[model samples]
Target: KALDLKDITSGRFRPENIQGVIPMPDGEHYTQMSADGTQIIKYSFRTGEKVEVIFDVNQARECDFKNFDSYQFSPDGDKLLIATRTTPIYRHSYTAVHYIYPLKRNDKGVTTNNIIERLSDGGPQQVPVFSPDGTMIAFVRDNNIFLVKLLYGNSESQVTEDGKQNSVLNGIPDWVYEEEFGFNRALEFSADNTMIAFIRFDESEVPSYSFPMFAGEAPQITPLKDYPGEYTYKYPKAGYPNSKVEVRTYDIKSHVTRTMKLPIDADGYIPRIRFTKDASKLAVMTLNRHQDRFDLYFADPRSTLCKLVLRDESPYYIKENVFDNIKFYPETFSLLSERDGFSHLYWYSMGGNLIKKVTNGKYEVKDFLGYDEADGSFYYTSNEESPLRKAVYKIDKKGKKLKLSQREGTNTPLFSQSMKYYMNKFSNLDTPMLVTLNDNTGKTLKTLINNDQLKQTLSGYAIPQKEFFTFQTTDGVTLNGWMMKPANFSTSKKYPVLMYQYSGPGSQQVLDTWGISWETYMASLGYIVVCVDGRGTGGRGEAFEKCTYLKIGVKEAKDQVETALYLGKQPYVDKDRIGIWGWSYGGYMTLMSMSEGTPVFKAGVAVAAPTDWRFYDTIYTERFMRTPKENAEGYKESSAFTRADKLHGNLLLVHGMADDNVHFQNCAEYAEHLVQLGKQFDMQVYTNRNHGIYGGNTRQHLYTRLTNFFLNNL
Candidate 1:
């Protein structure tokens, strides 16, 4: 029998109750939390024997930290920084009271060895990085990067001088970059720790958007009746300009700041910059607004000039896989490009001559780990057999390719320090997470962790089955998708369809991995949930992923409409009860597909969507569509703002008031256009929320609201 909704959400499936396990350096010894979650207890990894306490809160003196969410060990493994009282800022940025505890005492009677040294006074930090030497730690906070040297008695100093919120952001990504690019830390140090290179965002010219807060039904505070809480922030909408960004380098010893004069377009964005193995040179990557033209500038930190090392020009927006693989080594740099219509790895000298194409194939490489200079072997992960599943591989010096990961499922290899062993995390649609430690030759060394209890609990329940299916669209393009029907699906009875997609350029949704819990709950509600890897979705070759360039939601929506129509024609699907929902670009496509003029959708929900590209950030919007200046027609044709009057469905739009990624202006302007066109739609504004649209009960509440919306509308 299906569990009650109240029982399902109210602590019935407490994933937090799962035990924490961490494999230690020694194969025989493992570490886990103590009984009360107050201490770190070590155990034998091989024999499963209890060793001793690694760190204890009750036994230590001058220690007032009750509990910590995470702990980081120093390079020498002599110290531990306990992250306590954490507060998240952005997607990957957070602030915490960091406690530094030393393992052994030195000459003096310092037991803790500088215990509880606050990294920052009382704010959030991003990507705290420890130096390879283990003597210094650098982190970004409040848009500025800070460094603390433990050898210098924990002397905290601000590295960048011109960092200010919404104006000059140094060592940290802006809102859109963190959301779309999926990275928070922008500051990186040289291997030798002589210099630091970081991206500086000048978002002074970006437009601002705000939204009003209202007391809703979830939990109402009636005291603020007269005055309302309004959220205000600088948010660049689609087609609007984004921050003028550049990269700079800083000398740690000389305290000298030098601007890396990379030859980026004046209206372009420097997405990432990092120091190479050579302390003097920095790898700087820039892209035009439409993201089709990628340029790599190798700059000398001591000099003011830079030279263009590699440039990849694409008719469509350049995929991140192109430049994200620019590996900087002491001898030569490696890069991956789809310039030949397929993503292939190419080895290049520091001077930019193509030595050889390391891996050449028609299939796209999903990830590039690194190259071993001694053996001339390259290690990477790709979906050579099928796009839904990924496997690790090694290409030898003789151009022979060998599969490294023997096991199936979506295998993600996190290599160890020496690359002798790797932690392989494998999970499939029906499988829970299974992590194992494996040798370089794919021999299983030890089982690290497995979600046995969670898997057992799910197996006991009536869970919906997952299956992958493909169908041809009217455009003659084959679209891939995954479907989750009700547990006891009946083909004779008609079923409502709920479609989800992230249809953004170079993004894939139909992968062989465990999906969100919300989808599982929806499947319990007798609705068939489907996610289509529409046009512009990744995992396919460049031709398929970049097919929606410049047009944004036009082709994507058409493909989704075709998917709905195709599914509607099925004997098990209710033709008039199909719905679609998505977030960010996917959310934008939901609205576009519902308004595609075919009237295919009966209901839909869009969460934090950009109604128009003109109201979005320049870095992401301009990449695929170019600038609004260059492709106004394309932007308009792809925008829901221009097609608001054509909307045909029970639509519910939700946005975070403080969404810095897709500004609230996109929703407000689109809603205004719909209002002018005299269309009624439901709206939900999350007060003081950002792009992720998550918080205490935010995600659960949003999912519940969606559930209710479907129950009533579909």
Candidate 2:
């Protein structure tokens, strides 16, 4: 009588997955790693056929590793850097043991086999980046940068000293930067391969955040039956002292380290440091304490002299993606900024002169693909047509823009090196992923993956009817949302409504993508599931997204309450039976809305939520709300703890004990807040799990808990 639960929760209905597609520098063919982790397969882009297995574990003699995690091709394509024994440190950071393989050629000059050489006999290294000339490799070991010369029998030499655990770090980012700014490899090689640039971190003054590391699963993976372990690391909370960041360069031949004389505040942030095509120009991006001012400096590696190339300042805050979105060319660089209320691309000369604005519009540009110098055109994706839709476009030097996609929903394009061909991945609310190979003119060349099998598999389920709609809040602001009703619905009958959202600043959940999640399963179980993009959500513009600045949760919670009130008036909705749930920021919003004084939601679940901004990282929390010392009232009003006593809904809280990013300290603090008020609530804490809370049977158990909570309470 009931649909198979495995079909809904097992993730088997997902389309065929693909990972690690490395486009060759020549643009002739691309390389893909096999699923079995044994071989690197080269496939011709023109025919979508496998050409050869470039490297296989069975061919390598005396190989210690039974399987390889990943492989990177050298510049000349004559060598492969094999990654093995990969160990994850935190989110977006890991350490791996790498091996260099020298490829061999047969009499016909075709690659036959390769001899492997281990880079270091010591411990695992991090972020081993090859030089431009392909003769040398630089990596980090024990918080220090080391160079390995491939031509000299993989000769390893230390580049910098003074790197110590929990004190100083070289060539790798600190904990706060890794989690907030989102980058791990802080080292770079110059174009000529004569110099290396790296950011060093002095984290001795930063306050440490520690948690009990019980030997349970996932993070620990080794159940400690008798003894409980713990982890203590440097984590700067809001208004706390961060690492003293510095930009330094090392000369390869002379082995001299020089500090860059760039102007930066004592408590400022050096989010990114990159090297341009010019050997003399090393680009450095810096942000002030408030994160409202962004400055780009071009520094000389040898002289350590710097000049401010461009500055983008705002009253609210600058997004960190601007630093990574910069593209360096031979004579100029492209920068994306929201100076005109929406993110657009601007070309700048090397001498700090504005060439021209490459893109100008009312919508935000999503991604920058590439620039073709031959035609003087740039490729990117934008949501100009609708907030929930994305399409590819090509703009020329004269400000002429051409839409390159014909899809109605989301379209993401990956262009080849020559810019003559591209691979387009298309999907919508009602369609699965359809990947097609197309030419530059948007003509379809071939279908890469249609995903018809997945579509057919999903056809058998008692899926809900999903529809997108817009409603105006009481404050005269419009919001976009999607709703799902049970398949067997009646206009005369009322149903319980369950709403979900992630109302963080510049976040969007109402996208027109083919997403089948837990909400769909709840819809099948005779519940009305809905989601709305509140005022602070992205894709509209600067004014709408930044309106919640200084007070993070005020407007977002109001809009979510408005969504519930608006939905309550529907004929098929039960006003008193409305509930809400979210994860992370969404979870934070659930608490804010459930206690927003209106009391529209009857029950709610907040998983891994940051109850207070004071316990969060500096880079993210300080961007919008500034420091607690600067804005005490804003911090107090924005915290969920401020209104914990006003909560009238049935609440169920969840968190991971070892969440490094959003620490379990948040849950502990808010739990104490509720206890002091003599309030009753439910809680579930997964030991040894991080923010994701998934490893063995952890996700399934959490899902079951969530389902039971809603089924009983709603």
Compute each candidate's TM-score over C-alphas: 0.88, 0.97
Give the C-alpha lDDT of model 2. 0.88
lDDT per residue as tens, model 1, 290-317: 6777888878877868988888887777
The numbered model that scores best in lDDT is 2
lDDT of 2 at 290: 93
lDDT of each: 0.77, 0.88
Note the clash tally of each candidate. Answer: 19, 1
> lDDT (0-100) at residue 664 of candidate 1?
82
How high a TM-score does candidate 1 get? 0.88
